[PDB]
């Protein structure tokens, strides 16, 4: 058994770290559509944290970086999270060692940090190339009308309903 | 865990071991290093002789980059390119790993004996946006994902990035 999800609905979230690729304003903007990204199609909510303990800790790293998964420089592994729970549980990790974009001519902020929540929240990889469960990234021309999977829609309704 | 998935040459130059294999039995997690293990039989080796080698370690969560085997055998032979940390064969979700059987001949010649010839001083360079941008004349530019959607196309292939004269490597074939 063992399937982790979030047992609150009303969620926590703190941007620890910050990247010098984006401004401090692209960093943050990324984030809040990332979340609300699932949080459109659930019943969450996120508040934001600049102090202590969130449940969801956003951090920018580079190789070792305070747990079992070293970062590898640029490329390979772009980003990883966490599941739902307490601690390290529910976080998400980026590497600085690539170079984060507001749009695509680059790796995108948004389209990463949105696959990785979807993790903090519980969900795993999907099978679908067009899910944002893939983990393969996808680099896509207008992030105007990037759409959530139903895969992935499905998969998050599963969990919180 | 999101990934770019390298090119196969890629894979190549930049592990220190590529073997074909077949896993054999179910992942043991080890807490105490977050990483679990796959018990396999090497078959054949073509890069690492420096070693002899008979699991296969990667991290214990899916989240977290860690490569879960789909396939239940079948006696597959699985080409596995990653890396060796402490002793210990390494891969992850964006490490090259593949039934041997589903490759080209043209990634079988090569893993054999033709990747290595571009090794380094030739790079594949994954383009993400389509200006791209080329670095340097010793870089091949791999626009398979963009332009077919998917990493497993035709540059993949059938092609490798190989010297033409020093200072130029050009997309080539096997
Ligand atoms: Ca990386
Ligand atoms: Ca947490
Ligand atoms: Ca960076
Ligand atoms: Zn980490
Ligand atoms: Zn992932």
């Known amino acids: 058994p063992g399937i982790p999800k979030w047992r609150k609905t009303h969620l926590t979230y703190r941007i620890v770290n910050y990247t010098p690729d984006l401004p401090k304003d692209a960093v943050d903007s990324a984030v809040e559509k990332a979340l609300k990204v699932w949080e459109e199609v ?48 529910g976080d998400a990790h980026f590497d600085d060692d690539e170079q984060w974009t507001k749009d695509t001519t680059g790796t995108n902020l948004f389209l990463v940090a949105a696959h ?42 599963s969990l919180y309903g | 865990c999101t990934c770019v998935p390298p090119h196969p040459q890629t894979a190549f130059c930049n592990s220190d071991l590529v073997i074909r294999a077949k896993f054999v039995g179910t992942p043991e997690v080890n807490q105490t290093t977050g990483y679990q293990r796959y018990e396999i039989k090497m078959t054949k080796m073509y890069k690492g ?66 990747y290595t010839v571009g090794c380094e001083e030739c790079t594949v360079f994954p383009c993400l946006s389509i200006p791209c941008k ?41």
């Not at chain 2, 214990?60 to 002793?87: P, T, W």
């Not at chain 2, 080209?104 to 090569?110: D, E, F, K, M």
């Not at chain 2, 963009?146 to 059938?158: N, P, V």
């Open chain 1, 116 to 157: 990785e929540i979807g993790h903090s929240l519980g969900l795993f990889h999907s099978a679908n190339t067009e899910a944002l469960m893939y983990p393969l990234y996808h680099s896509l021309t207008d992030l105007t009308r990037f759409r959530l999977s139903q895969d992935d829609i499905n998969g998050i309704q």
């Open chain 2, 49 to 114: 002789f420096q070693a002899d080698i008979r699991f296969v370690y990667t991290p214990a969560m899916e989240s977290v980059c860690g490569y879960f085997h789909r396939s239940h055998n079948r006696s597959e032979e699985f080409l596995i390119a990653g890396k060796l940390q402490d002793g210990l064969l390494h891969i992850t979700t964006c490490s090259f790993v593949a039934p041997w059987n589903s490759l080209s001949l043209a990634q079988r010649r090569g893993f054999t004996k033709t």
């Open chain 1, 42 to 89: 659930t019943p969450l909510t996120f508040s934001r944290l600049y102090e202590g303990e969130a449940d969801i800790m956003i951090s920018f790293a580079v190789r070792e970086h305070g747990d079992f998964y070293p970062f590898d420089g640029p490329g390979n592994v772009l980003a990883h999270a966490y599941a739902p729970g307490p601690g390290i549980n």
């Open chain 2, 134 to 174: 080329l670095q340097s004349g010793t870089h091949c530019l791999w626009t398979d994902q963009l332009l077919q959607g998917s990493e497993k196309g035709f540059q993949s292939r059938h092609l490798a990035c190989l010297p033409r004269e020093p200072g130029l490597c050009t997309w080539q074939s096997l």
